Amino acid sequence: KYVKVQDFYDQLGKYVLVAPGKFSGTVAATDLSTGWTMAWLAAWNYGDTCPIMHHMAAFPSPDPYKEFEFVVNTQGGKNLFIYGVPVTVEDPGEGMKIYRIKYDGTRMNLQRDAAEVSGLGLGVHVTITPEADGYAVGDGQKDICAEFDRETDMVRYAWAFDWDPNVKDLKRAWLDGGTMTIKRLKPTLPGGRYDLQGSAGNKIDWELVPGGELAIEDGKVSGDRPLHSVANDALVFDPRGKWAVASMRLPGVCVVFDRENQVPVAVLAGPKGTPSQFQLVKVDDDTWTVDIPEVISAGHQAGFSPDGQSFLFMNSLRQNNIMVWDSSNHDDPTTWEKKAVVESPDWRGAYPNTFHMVFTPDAKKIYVTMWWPSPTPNGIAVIDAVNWEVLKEVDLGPDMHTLAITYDGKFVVGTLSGYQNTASAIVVMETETDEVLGFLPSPMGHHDNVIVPRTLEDLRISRSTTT
Amino acid sequence: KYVKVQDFYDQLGKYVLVAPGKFSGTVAATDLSTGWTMAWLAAWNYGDTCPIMHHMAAFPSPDPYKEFEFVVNTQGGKNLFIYGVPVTVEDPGEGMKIYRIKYDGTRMNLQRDAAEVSGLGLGVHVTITPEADGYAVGDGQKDICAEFDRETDMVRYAWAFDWDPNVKDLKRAWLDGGTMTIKRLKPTLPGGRYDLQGSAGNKIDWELVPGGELAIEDGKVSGDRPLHSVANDALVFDPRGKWAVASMRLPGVCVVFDRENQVPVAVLAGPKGTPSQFQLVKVDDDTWTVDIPEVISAGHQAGFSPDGQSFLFMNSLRQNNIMVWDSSNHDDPTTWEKKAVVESPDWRGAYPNTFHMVFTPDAKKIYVTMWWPSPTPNGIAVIDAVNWEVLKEVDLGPDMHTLAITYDGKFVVGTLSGYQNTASAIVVMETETDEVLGFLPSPMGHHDNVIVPRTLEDLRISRSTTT
Numbered sequence: 001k002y003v004k005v006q007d008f009y010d011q012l013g014k015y016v017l018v019a020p021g022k023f024s025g026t027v028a029a030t031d032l033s034t035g036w037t038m039a040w041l042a043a044w045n046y047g048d049t050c051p052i053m054h055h056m057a058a059f060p061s062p063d064p065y066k067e068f069e070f071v072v073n074t075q076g077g078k079n080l081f082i083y084g085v086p087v088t089v090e091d092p093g094e095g096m097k098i099y100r101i102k103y104d105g106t107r108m109n110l111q112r113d114a115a116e117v118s119g120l121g122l123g124v125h126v127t128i129t130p131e132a133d134g135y136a137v138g139d140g141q142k143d144i145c146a147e148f149d150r151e152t153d154m155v156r157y158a159w160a161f162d163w164d165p166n167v168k169d170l171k172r173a174w175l176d177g178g179t180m181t182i183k184r185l186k187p188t189l190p191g192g193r194y195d196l197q198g199s200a201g202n203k204i205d206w207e208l209v210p211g212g213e214l215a216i217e218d219g220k221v222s223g224d225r226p227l228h229s230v231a232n233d234a235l236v237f238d239p240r241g242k243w244a245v246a247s248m249r250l251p252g253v254c255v256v257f258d259r260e261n262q263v264p265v266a267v268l269a270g271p272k273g274t275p276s277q278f279q280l281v282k283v284d285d286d287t288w289t290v291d292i293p294e295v296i297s298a299g300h301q302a303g304f305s306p307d308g309q310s311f312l313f314m315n316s317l318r319q320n321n322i323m324v325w326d327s328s329n330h331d332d333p334t335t336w337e338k339k340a341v342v343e344s345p346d347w348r349g350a351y352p353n354t355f356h357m358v359f360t361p362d363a364k365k366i367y368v369t370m371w372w373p374s375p376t377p378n379g380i381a382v383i384d385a386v387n388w389e390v391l392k393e394v395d396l397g398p399d400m401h402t403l404a405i406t407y408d409g410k411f412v413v414g415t416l417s418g419y420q421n422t423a424s425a426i427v428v429m430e431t432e433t434d435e436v437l438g439f440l441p442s443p444m445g446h447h448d449n450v451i452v453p454r455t456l457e458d459l460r461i462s463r464s465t466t467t
Numbered sequence: 468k469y470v471k472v473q474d475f476y477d478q479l480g481k482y483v484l485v486a487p488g489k490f491s492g493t494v495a496a497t498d499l500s501t502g503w504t505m506a507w508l509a510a511w512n513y514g515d516t517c518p519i520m521h522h523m524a525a526f527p528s529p530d531p532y533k534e535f536e537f538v539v540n541t542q543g544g545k546n547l548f549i550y551g552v553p554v555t556v557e558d559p560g561e562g563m564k565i566y567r568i569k570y571d572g573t574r575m576n577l578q579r580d581a582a583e584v585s586g587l588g589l590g591v592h593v594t595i596t597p598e599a600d601g602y603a604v605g606d607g608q609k610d611i612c613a614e615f616d617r618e619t620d621m622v623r624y625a626w627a628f629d630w631d632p633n634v635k636d637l638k639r640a641w642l643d644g645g646t647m648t649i650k651r652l653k654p655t656l657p658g659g660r661y662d663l664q665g666s667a668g669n670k671i672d673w674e675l676v677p678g679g680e681l682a683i684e685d686g687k688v689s690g691d692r693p694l695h696s697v698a699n700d701a702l703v704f705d706p707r708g709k710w711a712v713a714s715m716r717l718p719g720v721c722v723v724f725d726r727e728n729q730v731p732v733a734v735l736a737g738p739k740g741t742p743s744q745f746q747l748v749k750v751d752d753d754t755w756t757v758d759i760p761e762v763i764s765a766g767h768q769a770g771f772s773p774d775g776q777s778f779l780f781m782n783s784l785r786q787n788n789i790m791v792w793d794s795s796n797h798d799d800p801t802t803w804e805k806k807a808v809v810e811s812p813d814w815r816g817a818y819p820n821t822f823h824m825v826f827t828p829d830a831k832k833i834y835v836t837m838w839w840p841s842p843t844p845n846g847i848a849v850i851d852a853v854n855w856e857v858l859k860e861v862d863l864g865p866d867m868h869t870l871a872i873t874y875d876g877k878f879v880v881g882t883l884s885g886y887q888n889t890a891s892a893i894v895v896m897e898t899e900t901d902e903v904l905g906f907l908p909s910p911m912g913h914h915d916n917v918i919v920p921r922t923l924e925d926l927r928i929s930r931s932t933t934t
């Protein structure tokens with residue numbers, strides 16, 4: 001007679017979608033086998049006065065439906081003013097919170113704020129270590145990343161990054177190059193803690209938007225110290241262990257760190273045209289530098305294929321493509337060498353902007369975001385990861401964000417977020433012939449989403465090895 | 468191969484569902500033809516410091532996808548402490564806002580706070596007048612209801628209700644009878660404004676929950692004036708025009724009001740066992756009284772069938788049934804006689820509590836809510852409104868709130884809201900053989916929802932004639 005939406009959910013199976021909602025100030029888990037939201041959480045109700053719920057990542061649980069834990073961070077300050085919502089809050093809080101929350105089989109519970117426990121507030125990407133024993137956050141306003149311990153929320157190590165332009169004027173500070181310093185950040189407060197919550201640390205007073213390097217160069221982004229900015233975005237993890245990679249938007253490079261010995265060991269150069277790497281120079285036991293002749297393009301998204309064998313960093317802005325290194329040699333990242341660039345005619349200038357990606361478990365395909373400012377249709381591009389070529393692009397709607405995949409490989413689940421004021425949805429695509437099955441309602445401006453992994457192997461294609 | 472969710476939405480058609488989300492702080496509209504959320508608004512963004520978004524109702528729009536306008540009010544104070552979210556807020560806002568919001572075919576726009584325009588702040592049911600030229604709001608803490616003009620947001624008339632118990636002890640205050648006063652409530656501030664925003668007016672410090680009539684009796688509800696409460700809930704409208712009916716929870720009556728002459732004309736007695744009406748006595752030009760020998764039962768849900776020929780009030784609490792009156796004589800409500808009572812073996816003392824309803828366009832059936840405290844399954848009873856009998860009950864999940872219906876009469880659309888901390892959903896049932904088609908995600912604690920009407924006729928089965 002009639003069609004039952006339960007038939008759609010029957011095919012997706014018992015996966016748990018989690019996603020935060022940015023200006024909605026909520027986070028929510030959804031049952032993809034029934035269409036229910038399992039639980040949601042409103043941070044205002046906990047006294048947060050700028051609850052911009054931003055990025056997030058879930059630890060694996062053997063049964064997400066009885067329990068799971070996740071990490072979700074917030075942004076604050078003038079970040080509240082930069083989207084199209086005519087916000088009337090005067091003096092909002094400062095965000096940079098890192099909330100630990102546990103779903104217990106009925107409700108979500110706010111465990112604590114890790115930014116308080118560690119001393120270190122960081123407001124961009126959140127990922128889980130491949131061993132599920134901790135997590136990392138990055139922040140492009142203060143240019144710090146750190147890997148924290150799951151059980152205590154204390155920082156295992158934290159790196160601060162600094163730019164020293166060869167030309168001291170914002171228009172040229174990146175294009176004509178400079179030296180980046182890589183600096184061990186050491187705790188300064190009792191108990192092993194930092195003094196870097198909320199805005200403490202900030203160089204620029206809000207996070208650079210997609211294309212937002214142009215803005216910083218044109219002197220349109222305020223802050224104390226924009227000339228020193230690199231805009232770190234993320235620390236993503238090699239699935240094989242040992243190394244974590246920090247992405248720096250403005251200087252177009254990624255830094256490979258030794259997690260156990262807490263040194264950086266290599267710098268990979270993003271733009272097509274430049275070598276595989278630049279030279280890392282140790283200055284002292286806590287200080288390294290790297291010189292860059294010119295920044296030919298800012299980069300964004302960074303991540304490893306599930307087997308560890310390829311590493312990717314996206315050029316965005318002046319170039320627009322995916323640079324791929326061969327990371328085959330687990331024993332020494334200073335050998336990792338460029339082996340492929342994914343290019344496509346429509347990939348010119350800042351838009352479409354490729355800010356997020358997910359591999360299929362066997363690693364032969366990639367789903368990658370194509371973002372544009374309103375009104376141009378946003379979408380997904382499907383990449384052949386064996387030959388490194390675009391297979392197809394699907395237009396979907398406004399403001400495309402992240403992409404997650406069911407662990408059996410079969411369905412891609414993505415979020416579009418209305419720029420915080422217009423249409424928002426969850427999108428489902430099947431990966432056998434890459435077609436959209438449609439949209440589920442989602443009143444939230446998500447800039448992240450995940451499916452709760454069950455095993456350490458599922459994390460290799462979740463929020464761990466890519467953003 | 469795969470089922471597309473678009474197939475389920477193709478059978479629903481271009482209807483727009485709207486609902487607010489109570490603790491979530493937000494409000495959202497969904498395109499039931501594509502699964503997208505069309506847009507959503509987070510009240511914290513406009514500086515509201517207790518954005519419990521409560522009840523709402525939408526003006527008809529000839530094309531809602533192009534634009535439509537709605538009203539959504541808030542609660543604050545200690546309402547924020549009444550649910551199991553371990554809220555930690557120091558100085559919560561007082562709530563009782565009445566927002567005017569307009570969707571402009573891209574975004575939601577906050578137009579203003581009707582409670583600041585009028586001075587009169589009310590936080591329970593919001594309904595639209597059948598001519599779509601104004602709206603009404605009730606409040607069970609202050610015991611006031613009013614009709615507001617749509618263009619100016621100024622009060623057309625408002626009424627204040629007061630209880631004068633025969634026994635001055637909260638335990639007997641309603642059981643052993645009393646007198647209720649109906650007072651015309653007049654502006655005290657310049658320009659025809661009230662001085663009654665926020666907590667001003669409050670007799671008890673929070674709204675009574677389902678079954679909370681026993682809490683007030685037991686001295687569990689603090690406030691300044693509990694012995695005087697009646698807990699007004701709503702002012703629903705005869706779809707034929709002329710009359711509005713205010714429901715009074717604690718004394719178990721409804722008062723019929725003549726909208727244009729600004730006087731009450733009749734009082735309907737809810738519990739089975741009592742006559743059709745108690746006698747309204749005029750005291751002076753602004754004051755009427757009505758005596759009740761004893762209150763056998765509190766009531767709650769109240770509303771008209773779409774042709775106006777039947778009027779319903781739900782006994783909850785000490786009886787649990789639907790009382791029905793013959794309202795076919797539109798010239799004189801003092802002739803409305805009880806004509807039936809719907810009863811069911813399971814409907815004994817408070818739970819399930821039947822607090823929400825919607826009619827089919829032809830008025831031949833009613834979908835009514837059945838609410839229990841966690842953990843018993845809440846759901847929907849289907850009522851034969853030709854013979855006044857229950858047809859079936861369907862169990863759904865936690866915390867069942869309101870129901871709407873598509874104006875072609877084909878699909879019933881309801882909200883479950885997880886007691887603000889667990890599972891939430893929208894549910895879809897087809898009215899042809901009353902089977903549930905399944906659930907769409909909705910991370911929101913809705914106590915309201917509407918499908919946006921397109922004509923005046925549509926309002927006869929929207930938030931106008933029933934809550």
Ligand SMILES: [Cu+2]
Pocket residue numbers: 125233234300301355467
């Ligand atoms: Cu990023």
Ligand SMILES: [Cu+2]
Pocket residue numbers: 054447
């Ligand atoms: Cu973001």
Ligand SMILES: [Cu+2]
Pocket residue numbers: 592700701767768822934
């Ligand atoms: Cu009610």
Ligand SMILES: [Cu+2]
Pocket residue numbers: 521914
């Ligand atoms: Cu309510």
